[PDB]
Amino acid sequence: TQGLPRVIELFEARRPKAKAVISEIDGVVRIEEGEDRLSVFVESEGFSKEYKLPKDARLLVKDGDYVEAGQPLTRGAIDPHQLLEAKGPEAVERYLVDEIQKVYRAQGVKLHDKHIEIVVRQMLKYVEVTDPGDSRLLEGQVLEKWDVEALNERLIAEGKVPVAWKPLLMGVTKSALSTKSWLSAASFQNTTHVLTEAAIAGKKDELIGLKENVILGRLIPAGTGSDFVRFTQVVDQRTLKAIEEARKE
Amino acid sequence: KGEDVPEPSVPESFRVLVKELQALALDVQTLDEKDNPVDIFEG
Amino acid sequence: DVPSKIGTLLDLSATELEQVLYFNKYIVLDPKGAVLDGVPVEKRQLLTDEEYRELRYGKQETYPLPAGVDALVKDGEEVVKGQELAPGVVSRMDGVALYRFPRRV
Amino acid sequence: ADGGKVKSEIYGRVEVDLVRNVVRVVESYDIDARMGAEAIQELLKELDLEKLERELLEEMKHPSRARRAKARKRLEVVRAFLDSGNRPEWMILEAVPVLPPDLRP
């Protein structure tokens, strides 16, 4: 597939048509049989993992070749969820960006990677718990807010459980969906679920993002509405010394 | 009157939503950094 | 909603039971369920409209009789579910019978 | 009747038949079974939330792992309500508020 459909496929972390098999394990390649049935083995010392192909499939490892942890066997597109678990979160990030660009580039478009990066990182915002310290053992949690517990219960109040987690490739939509602040969350496909829930828990916003404050009619937390700049006062020569002569009174 | 314009007290949008929420039960407390309440209404 | 944030905090057979606990009949045995309906009380669990009647009001059945006919069973008698109270009436419940207004003494 | 000799062996209503010279007791227990949101409210008002935290943190460790992704689920709502300020039972409104006139013209 090409064009915009690809860019969505990508930005949405979507397990495509012609997943074109990757080897789960390292090892040595062995193509076997033609026309009748086509299968490929990547068997190292110990394990012998077998990858049955369509037969029509245009595989791109010839017999004998040595192979890599998550290396493509077959051609086609690659599942970004299969890549996550086989070969980590960075390798994922690096696939997404470089593939998304593979199209804008291929066409005519020139844009900087950082944009795509900024977005891609958000696809990696959350992680699911395995064996917790405080909360229930299954919940999805923001990568940072788990460090708010991991490197918290292993320093000052050290002990209990560091909270083990798993890397969690969220598609662009899904990730947008699971977004802390209820105000923002409300604007998506089912506003009731949000509010119902957020009402039960004394949930609070804090209104960090923008989608939030525009909803309220508040002054956007960016540009001139950035905490880092909007408090800036300007005092004016004679105003300053005259303001100084009523301070020691 | 040749004045600068704004200092908009509170986005009406805000008031509206809060009240449009009350109407459906749900308290919707608005709170400053000291975490106590504000009353975006005075009336 | 979709997790039913009420019919989760107390179960109530998820929903279907909740929806049954206002619209369309069906009582929920709230506290001190003191009864037995074959087996003991159900506490926080479903009960019919009949089942309630047959539980805090007791079961009574009035078997209307045609004029000029007799009754096989005697006034005070532990009658049984299915045994003829007359050559036309069948008792639908196990228990003592009575004689509601006789026609000849 | 008759001092401490004649006693009722069951739970129920007392009927007194001064013609049959019997005291009968209709097999009727005294259940508090309320229907409607009044009940659902009543169930919610009296409910040890922490006691429901316990019973679940126990249903956390020794389940058959089947309906164990519903045992855990219960707590999200339980603990939510627990460190919230929200007393459940407020999910059932006695007073319904009215949206101000000018916002619905």
Resolution stated for this PDB structure, in Å: 3.2
- Domain assignment present for residue A121? The answer is yes
Residues with Cβ within 8 Å of C25's Cβ and at least 6 positions away in sequence, in order, are C48, C49
Handedness of CA D73, D74, D75, D79 (dihedral sign): positive
CATH code, domain with A157: 1.10.1790.20
Q: How far apart are CA A214 and CA B11, in angstroms?
A: 10
Rg (CA), chain A: 26
Our CA dihedral for A223, A227, A231, A232, rounded to 10 degrees, sits at -50
- The DSSP H or E segment spanning A119 is helix A113-122
Chain C residues in contact with D23 by the CB 8 A cut-off are none
User: Are A87 and A174 members of one domain?
Assistant: yes
CA C81-C86-C90 angle, 5° bins: 30
The set of residues, in sequence order, having a beta carbon less than 8 Å from that of A177 and lying 6+ positions away, is A185, A188
Question: How far apart are the C-alpha atoms of C10 and A193, rounded to whole Å?
Answer: 19
Note the Cα A29 to chain centre separation in Å.
Answer: 32
C5: helix, coil or strand?
coil
Q: Are residues A169 and A84 in the same domain?
A: yes
- Provide the 3-class DSSP secondary structure of residue A7: helix
Q: What does the alpha-carbon distance between residue A230 and residue A249 come to, in Å, rounded to a whole number? A: 30
A113 and A138 part of one domain: yes
Nearest CA in chain B to A212: B14
**Residue D27, helix vs strand vs coil:** strand
3-state SS, residue A13: coil
Question: Cα separation of C8 and D71, whole Å?
Answer: 10
Crossing angle of the two packed helices D71-82 and A191-200, in degrees rounded to 10: 60
Whether the CB-CB separation of C60 and C68 falls below 8 Å is answered with no
Angle between helices A3-11 and A90-107 (to 10 degrees): 160
Structural domain of A238:
179-242
User: Min CA distance, A199 vs chain D (Å)?
Assistant: 8
Interface of D with C in 34-63 (CB under 8 A): 34-37, 39-40, 42-44, 46-47, 52
When CB atoms are compared, the residue of B13, B25, B26 closest to A216 is B13
Residue C60 with chain D: CB contacts under 8 Å? 26
Q: Are A24 and A40 within one domain?
A: yes
In a domain? residue A1: yes
Spatial separation of the C-alpha atoms in residues B18 and B31, rounded to whole Å:
13
Chain D contact partners (≥3 CB pairs within 8 A): A, B, C
Hey, are the CB atoms on C1 and A193 less than 8 Å from each other?
yes
CA angle (C28 as vertex; C27, C30 as ends), nearest 5: 130
Q: Say whether both A12 and A118 belong to one domain.
A: yes
C-alpha distance from residue D63 to each of A131, C9, D70, D90, D94 (Å): 16, 19, 11, 32, 39
**Does any domain span residue A248?**
no
Question: CB distance C1–A192 less than 8 Å?
Answer: yes
Contact assessment for residue B37 and residue B31, using Cβ atoms and an 8 Å cutoff: yes
CB contact, 8 Å: D16 with chain C?
no
Phi (first) and psi of residue C30, to 5 degrees: -70, -110
> Looking at the domain assignment, is residue A212 inside a domain?
yes
Distances (CA, A) of C100 to C60, C61, C76, D21: 12, 11, 12, 17
- Strand spans (E) along A73-223: 126-130, 140-142, 164-167
* Residue A125 in domain: yes
Strands A27-32 and A164-167: unpaired
Please give the structure tokens belonging to residue B11.
Answer: 């986005």
> What's the number of domains chain A is made of?
3
CA distance readout (Å), C44 to A115, A117, C57, D44:
56, 54, 20, 11
Task: Report d(CA D81, CA C11) in Å as an integer.
Answer: 16
Domain containing residue A33: CATH number: 2.40.50.100
Residue-wise over C43-64: b if at least 16 C-beta within 10 A, else e? eeebbeeebbebbbebeeeeee
Are A1 and A116 part of one and the same domain? yes
Nearest to D35 by CA among C8, C37, C18, C1: C18
Q: Domain boundary at A154, A178, A202, which?
A: A178
Q: Are residues A11 and A86 in the same domain?
A: yes
Cβ-based interface (< 8 Å): residues of A facing C: 192-193, 196-197, 200
Give the minimum alpha-carbon distance from C41 to chain D in angstroms, rounded to a whole number.
Answer: 9
Q: Is residue A249 part of a domain?
A: no
In a domain, A45, yes or no: yes
Residue B43 one-letter amino acid = G
Do C60 and D24 meet the contact criterion of CB atoms below 8 Å apart?
A: no
Q: What is the DSSP letter of C20?
A: G
Asked if the C-beta of D9 comes within 8 angstroms of chain A's C-beta atoms, the answer is no
Q: Does residue A148 sit at the B interface (CB-CB below 8 Å)?
A: no
